[PDB]
């Protein structure tokens, strides 16, 4: 039946982060050049500290014709408008402004360009920043911004297909005053916005194109009986429709998805990575356990029983090299693990080390072979986090932590 505890969920104190590194997004602005899609940017430079004030005005006026930003989970690279070039984010600024916002629409105007631009760029789920909502025509008026969503909503439709209630994200800003950029507006400045900041929204979004159109990769968390086989799990990478094959990796065994259900037990057709899932599946599915991966049949998910580690133990040890045995937990998985080539330790700075240590100890680190008694599927930390993340336990509470680096045949 269920699993108790995910691999993460078995883990604490800040020692997580230096290993466990940001998630790399690439982010790209759309929009006229007087919207301030370019002194959006600047701004998010300057309020996230990657710039200084003068810096931020000299972005300003350079506009007049690799830069990157942080959120608490992740690093945005942001790309330039018109793979390492394929954006996850899509960011369309748009003029608040009186006059201004109409004439993107009117006979000259760049808005049906500018969405035309989001959909050849592979943006299906647009974020459109309502701007200037701090100038004299716009007062963080509701009426205003009610009026300026309400007609992007409909010509994003009627130019580029783009359905509002699933595809859109709108919000309000100001990338003047920073307003709600990084923190939410003030109660006594805007009332009645309640939602989240961009950068807050850009922080735990979860539509993100290249892991939506990346192989279907969903770890099994649970496995119950309905009314029928249920596999429940998080979609780590990729997208899944009602009636889809999927394979169980390591085992090579496919099966047929007849249905879908979210948190709420309410029947959905389609689910992506982020989320929360519950699959009734057809076929054969007597071999499959927990910590095994539903993933595409074309591309599926890796699985090895060789991989390089980075590490860093955490309590008791003092024990052998190139053969120390403990349960891994790279997701949901669970297994059993033993060091081939102890190579590393690294400190400070994670620069290398010279010499291949004997032994491990409270406070030291790795990078070196790893290998399995039966294979698990994973993949590189820097490929899909929670796919090589993992805590080691040695027969009680705790011992380790790591990533993956590379796989083995």
Same mark, same amino acid.
């Given at each position: 039946?269920?699993?108790?505890?995910?691999?993460?969920?078995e883990?604490d104190?800040?020692l997580?982060?230096?290993?466990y590194?940001?998630?790399?997004?690439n982010?790209?602005?759309? *929009?006229?050049?007087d919207?301030g899609?370019? &002194?959006?940017?600047?701004?998010?430079?300057?309020?996230? *500290?990657?710039?200084?004030?003068?810096?931020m005005?000299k972005?300003?006026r350079?506009?007049?014709?690799?830069?990157?930003?942080?959120?608490?989970?992740?690093?945005?690279?942001?790309?330039?408008?018109?793979?390492?070039?394929?954006?996850?984010?899509g960011?369309?600024v748009?003029?608040?402004?009186?006059?201004? $916002?109409e004439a *993107? $629409? #009117?006979?000259?105007? @760049?808005?049906?360009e500018?969405? =035309?631009?989001?959909?050849?760029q592979?943006?299906?789920?647009?974020?459109?920043?309502?701007?200037?909502?701090?100038?004299? +025509?716009?007062?963080?008026?509701?009426?205003?911004?009610?009026?300026?969503?309400?007609?992007?909503?409909?010509?994003?439709?009627?130019?580029?297909?783009?359905?509002?209630?699933?595809?859109?994200?709108?919000?309000?800003? !100001?990338?003047?005053?920073?307003?709600?950029?990084?923190?939410?507006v003030?109660?006594?400045?805007?009332?009645?916005? @309640?939602?989240? !900041?961009?950068?807050?929204?850009?922080? !735990?979004?979860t539509?993100? #194109?290249?892991?939506?159109?990346?192989?279907?990769?969903?770890?099994?968390?649970?496995?119950?009986?309905?009314?029928g /086989?249920?596999?429940?799990?998080?979609? #780590?990478? *990729?997208?899944?429709?009602?009636?889809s094959?999927?394979?169980?990796?390591?085992?090579? @065994?496919?099966?047929?998805?007849?249905?879908?259900?979210?948190?709420?037990?309410?029947?959905?057709?389609? !689910?992506?990575?982020?989320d929360? =899932?519950?699959?009734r599946?057809?076929?054969?599915?007597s071999?499959?356990?927990?910590g095994?991966?539903?993933?595409?049949?074309?591309?599926?998910?890796?699985?090895?029983?060789? $991989?390089?580690?980075?590490?860093?133990?955490?309590?008791?040890? +003092?024990?052998?090299? &190139?053969?120390? +045995?403990?349960?891994?937990?790279?997701?949901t998985?669970?297994?059993e693990?033993?060091?081939?080539?102890?190579?590393?330790?690294?400190?400070? /700075?994670?620069?290398?080390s010279?010499?291949?240590?004997? $032994?491990?100890?409270?406070?030291?680190?790795?990078?070196?072979?790893?290998?399995?008694?039966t294979?698990?599927?994973?993949?590189?930390?820097?490929?899909?986090?929670?796919?090589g993340?993992?805590?080691?336990?040695?027969?009680?509470?705790?011992?380790?932590?790591?990533?993956?680096?590379?796989?083995?045949?």
């Amino acid at each position: 039946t269920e699993d108790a505890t995910d691999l993460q969920n078995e883990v604490d104190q800040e020692l997580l982060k230096d290993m466990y590194g940001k998630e790399h997004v690439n982010i790209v602005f759309i *929009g006229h050049v007087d919207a301030g899609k370019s &002194t959006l940017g600047g701004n998010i430079l300057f309020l996230t *500290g990657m710039v200084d004030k003068r810096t931020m005005e000299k972005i300003e006026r350079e506009a007049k014709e690799r830069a990157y930003f942080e959120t608490e989970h992740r690093r945005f690279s942001l790309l330039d408008a018109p793979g390492a070039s394929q954006a996850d984010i899509g960011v369309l600024v748009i003029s608040a402004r009186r006059g201004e $916002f109409e004439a *993107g $629409f #009117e006979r000259g105007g @760049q808005t049906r360009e500018h969405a =035309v631009l989001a959909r050849t760029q592979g943006i299906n789920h647009l974020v459109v920043v309502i701007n200037k909502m701090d100038e004299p +025509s716009v007062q963080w008026s509701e009426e205003r911004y009610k009026e300026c969503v309400d007609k992007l909503s409909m010509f994003l439709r009627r130019v580029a297909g783009y359905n509002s209630k699933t595809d859109v994200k709108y919000m309000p800003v !100001s990338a003047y005053t920073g307003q709600n950029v990084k923190d939410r507006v003030d109660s006594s400045v805007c009332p009645w916005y @309640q939602g989240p !900041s961009l950068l807050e929204y850009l922080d !735990s979004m979860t539509h993100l #194109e290249r892991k939506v159109n990346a192989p279907f990769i969903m770890p099994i968390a649970s496995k119950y009986k309905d009314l029928g /086989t249920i596999l429940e799990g998080k979609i #780590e990478a *990729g997208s899944i429709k009602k009636n889809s094959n999927v394979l169980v990796m390591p085992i090579n @065994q496919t099966l047929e998805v007849t249905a879908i259900y979210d948190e709420a037990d309410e029947e959905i057709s389609s !689910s992506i990575c982020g989320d929360q =899932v519950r699959l009734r599946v057809r076929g054969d599915d007597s071999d499959v356990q927990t910590g095994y991966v539903l993933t595409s049949t074309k591309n599926p998910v890796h699985a090895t029983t060789r $991989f390089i580690a980075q590490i860093a133990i955490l309590e008791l040890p +003092s024990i052998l090299t &190139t053969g120390y +045995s403990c349960v891994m937990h790279i997701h949901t998985a669970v297994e059993e693990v033993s060091f081939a080539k102890l190579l590393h330790k690294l400190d400070k /700075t994670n620069r290398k080390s010279k010499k291949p240590p004997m $032994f491990a100890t409270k406070g030291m680190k790795i990078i070196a072979e790893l290998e399995t008694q039966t294979p698990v599927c994973m993949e590189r930390f820097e490929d899909y986090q929670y796919m090589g993340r993992f805590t080691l336990r040695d027969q009680g509470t705790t011992v380790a932590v790591g990533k993956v680096v590379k796989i083995l045949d």
